[PDB]
Design an enzyme around this catalytic site. Structure first.
Site, PDB file in Angstrom:
ATOM      1  N   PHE A 262       3.471   4.354   1.108  1.00 45.65           N
ATOM      2  CA  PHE A 262       2.382   4.577   0.885  1.00 45.65           C
ATOM      3  C   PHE A 262       2.206   6.621   1.478  1.00 45.65           C
ATOM      4  O   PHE A 262       2.455   6.820   2.070  1.00 45.65           O
ATOM      5  CB  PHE A 262       1.768   4.071   1.805  1.00 45.65           C
ATOM      6  CG  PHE A 262       1.652   2.458   1.643  1.00 45.65           C
ATOM      7  CD1 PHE A 262       1.635   1.634  -0.055  1.00 45.65           C
ATOM      8  CD2 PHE A 262       2.363   0.932   2.436  1.00 45.65           C
ATOM      9  CE1 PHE A 262       1.349   0.689  -0.410  1.00 45.65           C
ATOM     10  CE2 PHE A 262       2.196  -0.106   1.650  1.00 45.65           C
ATOM     11  CZ  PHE A 262       1.572  -0.414   0.669  1.00 45.65           C
TER      12      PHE A 262
ATOM     13  N   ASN B 214       3.043   6.068  -3.394  1.00 44.24           N
ATOM     14  CA  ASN B 214       2.457   4.689  -4.060  1.00 44.24           C
ATOM     15  C   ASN B 214       0.962   5.328  -2.243  1.00 44.24           C
ATOM     16  O   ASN B 214       0.935   5.201  -1.120  1.00 44.24           O
ATOM     17  CB  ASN B 214       2.493   3.505  -3.504  1.00 44.24           C
ATOM     18  CG  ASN B 214       1.969   2.299  -3.444  1.00 44.24           C
ATOM     19  OD1 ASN B 214       0.829   2.624  -4.036  1.00 44.24           O
ATOM     20  ND2 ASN B 214       2.482   1.301  -3.586  1.00 44.24           N
TER      21      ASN B 214
ATOM     22  N   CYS C 208      -3.507  -2.313  -3.556  1.00 42.16           N
ATOM     23  CA  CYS C 208      -2.934  -2.031  -4.616  1.00 42.16           C
ATOM     24  C   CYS C 208      -3.731  -1.894  -5.894  1.00 42.16           C
ATOM     25  O   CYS C 208      -3.509  -1.385  -7.008  1.00 42.16           O
ATOM     26  CB  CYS C 208      -1.486  -1.667  -4.425  1.00 42.16           C
ATOM     27  SG  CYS C 208      -0.099  -1.321  -3.121  1.00 42.16           S
TER      28      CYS C 208
END
Lengths: 387, 387
Positions: free
Chosen positions: B213, B334, B162
């Protein structure tokens, strides 16, 4: 609205190699004894037609020995890696996740030493590899092994292949020239446990792979504006560039699968390179006032004998120009992105032992050449320091 | 032995974002309905205490919807991905090796349009992803989809995690400032096929990433010295650095295995960041005059609702500051390395909508923040353009 002065001051002089380390795993593997050992350790002693081809390939390969973490002990401890295509990736990464940075760290200790500086002045790590991936990366794992500062700035290039060593110098050039006092570890480390597998008639490229690939780790300390007296530039970096070769798409293909890393070659990589390399090098030459080929040293990834012979031919090079490349090929194999880092170190060593005028066997400028998938050709133009 | 003018001319001004593009696969997944979808299509729709543990995770998540390539159709065609631990890396790569760069090309067409430049003037690509590896790399794929020059210089950061969006800008900064004329595609693209996996009471952590995700790609055009009237700067890049947090070893491990990318979240991640973020951010302030926290804009990687809440609290930021990160969380989840590029873009869109004096909701300087394995905290300092 007010323009600002560069808040991270930039450096002035060309990025300079200031110290070189290299490092291999302890175990040697003579290439004369390797066809037996390999076919026997992979339970393929029955494939004698195959084994004879392998022996001929090894006998033409230009390699006397390689260094390999995969000793017999290890391969027996890890049967999956000894198969052709059984699901093995997990136990392959368990090896390289540790050993890729352990190897680099050994080489980094020596480069740091030749450099003369303090560890805590190391500000950047630029790391290539083709031997697995992890999170955090080998760059992080290195930094912890060396006790670098926690604010070291990292560029982790996983999965590059055989141009990676050129790349790390390319990147390290910009990081060093653009940051006052930046001292970069340019790092290429390679361990074969991700590509190794038993031979097969269906995989000619794994046969060549099994005869040339070996282990190694090179690391350069790279920085601009060397403190006079206190630092010794070995080489100045004046040009970095790369290119996709023409009509080369598909040539090299590298696929990370459940059974590790598998290569397929569908185009003549040596001919695509030798055919197309004069044109590009003609451009890289111009900034340093185009020297003749034979006035330049040649740190050329030793991918095999095929590439080094044809380039030497196409360019009419005197046979000393490739000597450093052939030496590394012979003593270490194709070590992927680390290989070309060894080759330049070796050019430096052949310069002192013969007493040449520059650390490039009497040449001012030379080339630092990698090549790999995409058919990317990477070249840097370097200047050799005086002797 | 002469000193020589920099053979590859450097630039002068700071590195500027000149265009911005994003892209997402079309299928939308309302998080209200997701644990129903997720658990059925993985034949786990029976483990009812797991499913409730996961619904309460999604409700705490601050996510309204995500975009994913992995539709019902795609999952039925790759039943492996729908299992806990069966080998599946091969099918996973078959997806992400075409999709990761195909998405980036979609976003890059947009960024190139906003820039106004000719594609033939792109000189560099800097690509991050956590969604597979390949050779040649996604960087070369993207170049081929965009018909870029064959001489384009490339930096391919596979397996970043990330924090890779901040990583690409940092590399872009140096490549763009150290090269006169340079125009850099800064690329981050993510596709969850590699990390997807069914739930299981022995994979505690996997439930977190299954709830957060999502897929998306961001690309910036980065260069120094904008052509006045012609190219228009949206942000200037003024500082880039990073740090490993104290006492954070192992808080985000990610292993690429035969059954795909598997994650291990073995610490309080929002805590570790909050406790140490101010110290290090206090240092990034200083070269642009240490503006107060609440005089700066905040492009923060939206790792999860808990990280943004805690940093809002530790630094006592007015509630407008995080809204751009929270929007990106709400509407895209995300997206790992790509998310923070969406945030900055969302901050610019929010600025226009409200008629702020800067593209940073009025503030002149802002942080562009990413984090991940290490624990690595990556911070850039940007200057928003009027108006």
């Amino acid at each position: 609205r007010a323009a600002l002065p560069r808040a991270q001051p930039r450096a002035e002089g060309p990025a300079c190699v200031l110290g070189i380390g290299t490092a291999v795993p302890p175990a040697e593997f003579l290439q004369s004894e390797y066809p037996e050992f390999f076919f026997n350790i992979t339970n393929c002693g029955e494939k004698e037609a195959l084994k004879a081809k392998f022996k001929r390939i090894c006998d033409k390969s230009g390699i006397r020995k390689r260094h390999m973490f995969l000793t017999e002990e290890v391969l027996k401890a890890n049967p999956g890696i000894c198969t052709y295509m059984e699901p093995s990736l997990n136990v392959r990464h368990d090896i390289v996740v540790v050993q890729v940075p352990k190897l680099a760290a050994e080489a980094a200790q020596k480069a740091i030493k030749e450099w003369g500086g303090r560890k805590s002045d190391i500000t950047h790590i630029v790391f290539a590899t083709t031997s697995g991936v992890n999170m955090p990366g080998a760059d992080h794992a290195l930094a912890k092994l060396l006790g670098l500062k926690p604010t070291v700035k990292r560029v982790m290039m996983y999965q590059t292949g055989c141009f990676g060593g050129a790349s790390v110098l390319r990147v390290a050039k910009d990081l060093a020239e653009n940051n006052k006092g930046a001292r970069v570890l340019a790092v290429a480390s390679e361990v074969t446990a991700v590509t190794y597998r038993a031979p097969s008639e269906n995989h000619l490229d794994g046969l060549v792979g099994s005869a040339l690939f070996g282990d190694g780790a090179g690391v350069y300390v790279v920085g601009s504006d060397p403190k006079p007296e206190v630092e010794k530039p070995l080489f100045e970096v004046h040009w970095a560039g790369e290119t996709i070769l023409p009509e080369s798409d598909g040539a090299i293909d590298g696929h990370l699968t459940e059974a590790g890393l598998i290569f397929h070659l569908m185009k003549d990589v040596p001919g695509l390179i030798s055919k197309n390399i004069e044109k590009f090098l003609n451009e890289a030459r111009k900034p340093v006032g185009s020297p003749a080929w034979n006035e330049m040293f040649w740190a050329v990834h030793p991918g095999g004998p095929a590439i080094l012979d044809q380039v030497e031919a196409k360019l009419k090079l005197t046979k000393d120009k490739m000597q450093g490349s052939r030496d590394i090929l012979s003593e270490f194999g194709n070590m992927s992105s680390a290989s070309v880092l060894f080759v330049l170190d070796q050019i430096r060593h052949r310069s002192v032992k013969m007493g040449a005028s520059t650390l490039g066997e009497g040449s001012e400028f030379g080339f630092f050449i990698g090549f790999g998938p995409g058919l990317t050709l990477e070249v840097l133009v370097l200047r050799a320091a005086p002797n």
